[PDB]
């Protein structure tokens, strides 16, 4: 004998977890996130792009569109904490977004996704074009200039 | 920081298990720990505490002491419990019939009890017969009868048995023990 094996061994029976009192209540997103609001993307490959907010998804993500024709940002999910909600709003009455959901975004581009992008973009362009310089605003990327103070700036 | 009003981490100062490694004494301690925990009878708790006691704290209880305790008014039929050794005593010539529960019995003490017609039983037998110590009479031997005790507290005017190897004339009896040589104590 090299170690004189112990008299008692711990049991290899994994005890069940006790019942957790944590219900998954719906997220209360801030009042600035209203569908149709123009958001500035703070991170990702499209960081700095100004996109249009759309249906709020069940995984707590925001469905956003560039529109793709305007600045090249497609219909895609985005985290609410990685966007700045500006005070510019386009009307989303007429854009049908009930189809898009977590399963729709679950993991070259699909022709279906191209077609829904075109369908949503048509209405988005129609709504944007009644506001002067709004298309140019959405085409231009947001950036901080020298002297910009985000704690004082309004969006 | 805390202004402590008492010593911190102070042990209780009382035994919680016997110092002995006697497996049978440990088994008795386990049985009476169970009884003291789950009976609420004070007899079981005091027996459990007595089982922890050291040898000098368990002086022998003579059969004559047991007989004198049984001569108490109303104690004639009580079971005598001695957590320790029961010794014989030829100075008593008439022993009554009784039941004695003890840790140990001297051969002579057991013979005297049996010849008087009683029984000598162990503490676990006593536990089975009387789980709550019904009709029991706990006896304790004389603690302060020890040879060591009379030397305790030695000092002037105490009368407390000086520690000495030889006794007699010329052995600590002249100066400080009588007025004719200096002073008495």
């Amino acid at each position: 004998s090299a170690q004189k094996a112990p008299k008692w061994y711990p049991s290899e029976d994994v005890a069940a977890l006790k019942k957790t009192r944590k219900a998954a209540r719906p997220q209360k997103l801030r009042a600035s996130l209203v569908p149709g609001t123009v958001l500035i993307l703070l991170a990702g490959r499209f960081r700095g792009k100004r996109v249009v907010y759309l249906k709020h998804l069940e995984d707590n993500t925001l469905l956003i569109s560039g529109p793709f024709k305007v600045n090249g940002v497609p219909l895609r999910r985005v985290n609410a904490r990685y966007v700045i909600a500006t005070s510019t709003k386009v009307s989303v009455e007429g854009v049908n977004v009930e189809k898009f959901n977590v399963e729709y975004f679950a993991k070259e581009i699909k022709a279906e996704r191209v077609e829904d992008q075109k369908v949503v973009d048509k209405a988005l362009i129609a709504e944007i074009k009644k506001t002067p310089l709004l298309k140019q605003y959405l085409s231009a990327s947001f950036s901080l200039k020298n002297g910009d103070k985000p704690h004082m700036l309004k969006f | 920081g805390i202004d402590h009003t008492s010593k911190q981490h102070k042990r209780s100062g009382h035994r919680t298990a016997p110092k002995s490694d006697n497996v049978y004494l440990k088994l008795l301690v386990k049985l009476y720990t169970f009884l003291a925990r789950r009976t609420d009878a004070p007899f079981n708790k005091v027996v459990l505490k007595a089982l922890f006691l050291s040898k000098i704290n368990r002086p022998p209880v003579s059969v004559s002491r047991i007989a004198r305790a049984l001569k108490q008014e109303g104690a004639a039929n009580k079971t005598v419990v001695v957590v320790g050794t029961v010794t014989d005593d030829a100075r008593i010539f008439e022993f009554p019939k009784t039941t004695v529960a003890a840790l140990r019995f001297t051969a002579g003490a057991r013979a005297k009890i049996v010849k008087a017609g009683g029984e000598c039983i162990t503490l676990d037998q006593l536990a089975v017969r009387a789980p709550k110590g019904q009709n029991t009479l706990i006896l304790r031997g004389p603690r302060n009868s020890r040879e060591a005790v009379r030397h305790f507290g030695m000092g002037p005017h105490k009368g407390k048995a000086p520690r000495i190897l030889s006794t007699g004339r010329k052995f600590e009896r002249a100066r400080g023990r009588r007025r004719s040589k200096g002073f008495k104590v």
Partner: protein
Amino acid sequence: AEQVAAERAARKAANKEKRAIILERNAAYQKEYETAERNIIQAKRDAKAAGSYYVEAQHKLVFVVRIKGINKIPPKPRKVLQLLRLTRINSGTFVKVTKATLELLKLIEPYVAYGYPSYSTIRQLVYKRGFGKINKQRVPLSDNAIIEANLGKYGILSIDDLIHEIITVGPHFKQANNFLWPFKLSNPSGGWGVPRKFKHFIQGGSFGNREEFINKLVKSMN
């Protein structure tokens, strides 16, 4: 035989009855507090209208917080602090005001900040930092059953019964206060409001009687 349903239902019924008793007792306490406060206000107004001065009754209760550490304390004040159970800095106790306790407060003045606690201060103290001394152990007062099991013999059935017995110095104030473990408060959240704590409150410090400002101090400390 089941011996489960006919016991849990009876326990739920007894709990509901106890809660009804506590509800009516708390409503009576609220009415008593409202009546006493409005009576004091109206007595002051009536005395002023009659051209007299209403001298308010001297305060029967103080809250004392030890604001000095445990080092370099003379033996008599140290013993008085120990007997008031302030054996740690930022520990606090309620003291019923008599001559015997006022002399103790006088002895320990340079090491404590004390004053007259309001109902809100007492309620917040007992609710947040209320611990009972049960079998020499510090047990949080998280349920009314604990208070009932330890102070029920004195007629105290709930945490609000305990608070009432503290604020109104009742027949069993001594037992209720001693049942309450000394409150372990933190340092004040906005600071002490003075550069140096260890001169008298009257002299711009923190110790001594700060009679009504003890509420602000204890609230910032709680």
